């Protein structure tokens, strides 16, 4: 049975590689504190305080907390991530299991200056999953508070909150309030455990590979085309130079002129920034020159935006202003961190199919030329979908997110999340957890006011998550060797992806998925 | 099994709408304190202290406490109440379940100035239901201490007491004393739980609708009657004007004169008060002008009294003095609260069938006229049941009571409770709960006096209540759209029926049931 003196689960951290499948399992130790002193609170921000209109909000913070494993380093060790990206053309999630076990509730009393902590054996926690998607879904915004990448670390559970419609700092009639105690929930004492299972819906494999061809090079280099293009509008001669028409076939020496079947993907142009700072304009342009969208009178940066190549050849010092993912190095500051404290990703691989984020999409015609008027052209800085476009998605990273919830709407176009990962109409459900309030002694004459005098408590336990992943094997006939992700050979003060002398785990660099190649 | 380390129940708050039925379930957290230091006490009030004869009483307070869920906001969220009142002509209760679980007994010791709290694992609580209706039934007086409307709040359990017959502050031979330890009771330690079920007896549906016709307008407007009425007692002419008899048929232009089948319901007249205070008489008349009944030498206000319309057309600023239900706004004072701190209900819908509370019922004849004496009339300020009367009951509110117990008597007339809701001869039974006394250490030489030295204790737990309700669907052929209960569209500082910045839940207004319409 389950009692005070027996454990309700075991520690599972493992990975198993079987054929076309890999199964990861992770266990961590968590600590859960009481939030808001058991209260729900209205929160808002408005111009009155001095915020700009672009930052206003209205919402609620709750006493509850939630579990989040939406980063890949929750499930994969760095060596496992190497096995995946060097050997496979793609992967996708299939199913998951979740367990919550070995739960301990503790009470802390304050007397004079000294603080003491004891067990409370009869207290509970409450847990439920939102399986019908009835709550605002705050997973998928890339918040802090996921399970830690390193299995020995103990993490704090984050507080749940949400936003609803606002006008300035005020609410409107359509604004919704939610009470989370209004769902069914399971209550657990120190001997109880909790578990559920979930199945992923069909989703396309993430493409982990780069193309070894480019979209404008798909032709046979040895042969002419049978089609023709207009090669000459004027006679080339001694003196006159009158109007003429002349035509040529496309061939090996004019590839720019040949007829083609396909177009590069869409473009929304970003401003370019150099990591060599003396090359940048001297001014503070991050917001005023930023790439933005405009919704209901608010301006919001398109960050990272649609997938575009970070730079062209030999340009690596440049990046789009708001167009890339940027991670932190360990102990990086929250505000105004220096360039040496952060890690910049590069989407450079998709340069074959996708326009570079800092250039125009192309050129079109402005006017109607004639004998009287010379022709004029114009530059295309944003281009939506054209028939014949092909494109790649943004890459995924070991530090980065896995899935997002597709918003429930009448229409969408190519619902792949812009921060990267798998779009899901029915994502893995969110998991809510709370300490049950325990009153301090009531008065001995009746009073109708709600009791707000409590014994301070927190809880701890273990959590397990297990995901099964499907693999897509690499089939290539390429003769020469591939690029692989590898560790450095040379000696160093510390080992990458390990602890230091102080005990702190760190991740030296971001690692994407695209190493193997494939024909376009 | 059930032990210290396992939970004995789960959190259920939900509503399920199925066909003609809706099922509500609510869970709250409660705290129970020791009352009267485990004693029974005689209580009384008499003129000697300076109370008036109208307020005297004799009775007993007990160490026990009781559970009360007799308000509708215990079972319905504001959105659920909207679903009910906008879509349905009626509803009634069918059956209920009750659970009591996850019980924690705590002991508190006082030393010097510091106070400490610990678990006591072997202590019990006692619980019983009075299924045979053998105790004075104090539910149905609209007392404070029901389960809170908002599910996250923790509430204190109220102390049980009762009154018996008095003469002044003294008792009489017929007065009864009750010991609640003289019933069988269930004892629970921290692993035990308690439950029972109950079935409601057949009761008429509450009418949630207003009439779209009035009782004096039921005729066909296009046609004459074949009956006649006395239209003239005197000749209309040049000079003489002698006695005559003349007769006319009732028709479209005289509806006041037509013959009719039915009468308005009963009347007991209330004094009228304006919310514009400059229109009221300058004097303190609330008690001296109040509407009263008289029983065994005591005067008691008829509050709210029989169901009557609050005001007539375009009169909304007026209300009957003691004739309506009045709720409080959050943080309203207990005594001498201002008009802006309270919420006044309106029975305005029943104006079609029911007399207005502040006017006479009608006119009758005083005398016998003749050639010598002119006719005299008199005003009817109170009227009991006449054959041919029809009437509506008072409406129910989300903040208001659900049922009352019909007193056990030889006779009653239309036993619908005057504060509103369902009259029941066998109501849901009352549920009594108490902490079992634990002695402090006794002396080591025997003493016969009862031990009155105890360890201070209180308990906490969860309580669940589930009610199934039957619905009566709306059948109407009305072409134009109905009135509906709706939230306001415009922006505001807070959301109605939510928490504020401080965490306090409030209810902005009272909400009745009558929106849909029905033919008379």
């Amino acid at each position: 049975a389950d009692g005070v003196g027996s454990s309700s689960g075991n520690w599972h951290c493992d990975s198993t590689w079987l054929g076309d499948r890999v199964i990861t399992t992770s266990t961590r130790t968590w600590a859960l504190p009481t939030y808001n002193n058991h209260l729900y609170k209205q929160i808002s921000n408005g111009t009155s305080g001095g915020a700009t209109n672009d930052n206003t909000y209205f919402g609620y913070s709750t006493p509850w907390g939630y579990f989040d494993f939406n980063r890949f380093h929750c499930h994969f060790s760095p060596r496992d991530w190497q096995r995946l990206i060097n050997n496979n053309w793609g992967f996708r999630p299939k199913r998951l299991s979740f367990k919550l076990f070995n739960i301990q509730v503790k009470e802390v009393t304050q007397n004079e200056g000294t603080k003491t902590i004891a067990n409370n054996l009869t207290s509970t926690i409450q847990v439920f999953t939102d399986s019908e998607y009835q709550l605002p879904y705050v997973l998928g915004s890339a918040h802090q508070g996921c399970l830690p990448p390193f299995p020995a670390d103990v993490f704090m559970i984050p507080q749940y909150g949400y936003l609803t419609l606002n006008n300035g700092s005020q609410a409107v009639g359509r604004s919704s309030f939610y009470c989370l105690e209004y769902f069914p929930s399971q209550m657990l004492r120190t001997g109880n455990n909790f578990q559920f299972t979930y199945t992923f819906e069909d989703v396309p494999f993430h493409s982990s590979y780069a193309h070894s061809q480019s979209l404008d090079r798909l032709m046979n280099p040895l042969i002419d085309q049978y089609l023709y293009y207009l090669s000459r509008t004027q006679t080339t001669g001694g003196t006159a130079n009158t109007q003429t028409l002349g035509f040529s076939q496309g061939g090996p020496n004019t590839m720019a002129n040949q007829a083609k079947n396909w177009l590069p993907g869409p473009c929304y142009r970003q401003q370019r920034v150099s990591t060599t700072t003396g090359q940048n304009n001297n001014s503070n342009f991050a917001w005023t020159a930023g790439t933005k969208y405009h919704l209901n009178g608010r301006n919001s940066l398109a960050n990272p935006g649609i997938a575009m190549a970070t730079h062209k050849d030999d340009e690596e010092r440049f990046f789009p202003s708001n167009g890339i993912l940027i991670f932190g190095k360990q102990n990086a500051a929250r505000d105004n961190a220096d360039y040496s404290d952060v890690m910049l990703t590069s989407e450079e691989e998709i340069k074959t199919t996708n326009p570079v984020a800092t250039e125009e999409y192309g050129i079109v015609a402005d006017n109607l030329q004639q004998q009287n008027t010379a022709p004029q052209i114009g530059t295309v800085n944003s281009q939506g979908a054209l028939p014949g476009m092909v494109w790649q998605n943004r890459d995924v990273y070991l530090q980065g997110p896995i899935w997002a919830k597709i918003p429930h709407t009448d229409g969408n176009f190519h619902p792949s999340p812009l921060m990267g990962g798998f779009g899901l109409k029915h994502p893995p459900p969110q998991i809510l957890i709370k300490n049950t309030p325990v009153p301090a002694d009531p008065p001995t004459t009746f009073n109708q006011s709600k009791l707000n005098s409590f014994i301070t408590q927190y809880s701890t336990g273990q959590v397990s998550v297990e995901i099964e992943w499907e693999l897509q094997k690499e089939n290539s006939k390429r003769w020469n060797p591939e690029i692989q992700y590898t560790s450095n050979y040379y000696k160093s003060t510390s080992v990458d992806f390990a602890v230091n002398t102080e005990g702190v785990y760190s991740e030296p660099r971001p690692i994407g998925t695209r190493y193997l190649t494939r024909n376009l | 099994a059930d032990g210290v380390g396992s939970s004995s129940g789960n959190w259920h708050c939900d509503s399920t709408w199925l066909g003609d039925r809706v099922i509500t379930t609510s869970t709250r957290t409660w705290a129970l304190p020791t009352y009267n230091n485990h004693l029974y006490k005689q209580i009384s009030n008499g003129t000697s202290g300076g109370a008036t004869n109208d307020n005297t009483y004799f009775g007993y307070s007990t160490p026990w406490g009781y559970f009360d869920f007799n308000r509708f906001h215990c079972h319905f969220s504001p959105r659920d109440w909207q679903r009910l009142i906008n879509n349905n002509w009626g509803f009634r209760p069918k059956r209920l379940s009750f659970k009591l679980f996850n019980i924690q007994v705590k002991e508190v010791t006082q030393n010097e100035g510091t106070k400490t709290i610990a678990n006591n694992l072997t202590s019990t609580i006692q619980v019983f239901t009075d299924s045979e209706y053998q105790l004075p039934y104090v539910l149905g007086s609209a007392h404070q201490g029901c389960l809170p409307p908002f599910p996250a709040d923790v509430f204190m359990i109220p102390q049980y007491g009762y009154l018996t017959l008095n003469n002044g502050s003294q008792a009489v031979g017929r007065s009864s004393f009750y010991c609640l330890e003289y019933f069988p009771s269930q004892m629970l330690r921290t692993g035990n739980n308690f439950q029972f079920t109950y079935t409601f007896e057949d009761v008429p549906f509450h009418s949630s609708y207003a009439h779209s016709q009035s009782l004096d307008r039921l005729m066909n407007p296009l046609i004459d009657q074949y009956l006649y009425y006395l239209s003239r007692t005197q000749t209309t002419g040049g000079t003489a004007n002698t006695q005559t008899l003349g007769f006319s048929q009732g028709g479209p232009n005289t509806m006041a004169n037509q013959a009719k089948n039915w009468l308005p319901g009963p009347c007991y007249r209330q004094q009228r008060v304006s919310t514009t205070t400059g229109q009221n008489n300058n004097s303190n008349f609330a008690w001296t002008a109040g509407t009263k009944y008289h029983l065994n030498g005591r005067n008691s206000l008829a509050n709210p009294g029989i169901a009557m319309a609050t005001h007539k057309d375009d009169e909304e600023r007026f209300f009957p003095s003691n004739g309506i239900l009045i709720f409080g706004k959050q943080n309203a004072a207990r005594d001498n609260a201002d008009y802006s701190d309270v919420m006044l209900t309106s029975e305005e819908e029943i104006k079609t069938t029911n007399p207005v509370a502040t006017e006479e019922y009608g006119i009758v004849a005083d005398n016998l006229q003749q050639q010598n004496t002119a006719p005299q009339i008199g005003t009817v300020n109170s009227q009991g049941a006449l054959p041919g009367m029809v009437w509506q009951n008072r409406d129910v509110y989300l903040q208001g009571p659900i049922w009352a117990k019909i007193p056990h008597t030889d006779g009653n007339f239309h036993p619908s409770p005057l504060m509103g809701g369902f009259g029941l001869k066998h109501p849901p039974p009352q549920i009594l709960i108490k902490n079992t006394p634990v002695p402090a250490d006794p002396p080591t030489t025997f003493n016969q006096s009862k031990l009155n030295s105890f360890i201070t204790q209180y308990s906490t737990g969860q309580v669940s209540v589930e009610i199934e309700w039957e619905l009566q669907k709306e059948n109407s052929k009305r072409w134009n759209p109905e009135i509906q209960y709706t939230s306001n569209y415009y922006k505001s500082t807070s959301v109605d029926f939510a928490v504020n910045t401080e965490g306090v839940y409030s209810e902005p207004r009272p909400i009745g049931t009558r929106y849909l319409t029905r033919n008379l």
Epitope: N37, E107, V108, Q110 | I117, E502
Partner: nanobody
Framework: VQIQESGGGIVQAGGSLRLSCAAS????????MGWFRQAPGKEREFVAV????????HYSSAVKGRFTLSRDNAKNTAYLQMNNLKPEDTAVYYC???????????????????WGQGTQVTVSS
């Protein structure tokens, strides 16, 4: 929701001084009412706190055995009576209020929403 100080003054050592505090509105607020003090050039220190029903009360170690905290819900006010004053009790006392009382966290300033202007109490020997 204004808290307001009163009863400030200067006293000789051993005297009995009484600080007072009042609020306006939200009796569904002001659940817990308490006192802090900040001496010249020093950190703010929690002095006392009591809840609405008077069930739970706490005093600072230095404060205990000399001060008593009392409360009147009718007037929506709270009082602090002070006995056997020592000149290290010169400080600026703040009335403080909050929606909740916790057993672990009550002595932290993080748990109080509202703060008065303060009072100066001087104690001389």
């Amino acid at each position: 929701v204004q808290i307001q100080e009163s009863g400030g003054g200067i006293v000789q050592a051993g005297g009995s001084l009484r600080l007072s505090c009042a609020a306006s509105g939200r009796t569904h607020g002001m659940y817990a009412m308490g006192w802090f003090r900040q001496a010249p050039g020093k950190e703010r220190e929690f002095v006392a706190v009591q809840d609405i029903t008077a069930s739970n009360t706490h005093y600072s170690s230095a404060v205990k055995g000399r001060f008593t905290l009392s409360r009147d819900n009718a007037k929506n006010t709270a009082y602090l009576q002070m006995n056997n004053l020592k000149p290290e009790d010169t400080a600026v006392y703040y009335c403080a209020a909050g929606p909740t009382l916790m057993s672990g966290s009550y002595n932290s300033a993080r748990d109080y929403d509202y703060w008065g202007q303060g009072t100066q109490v001087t104690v001389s020997s």
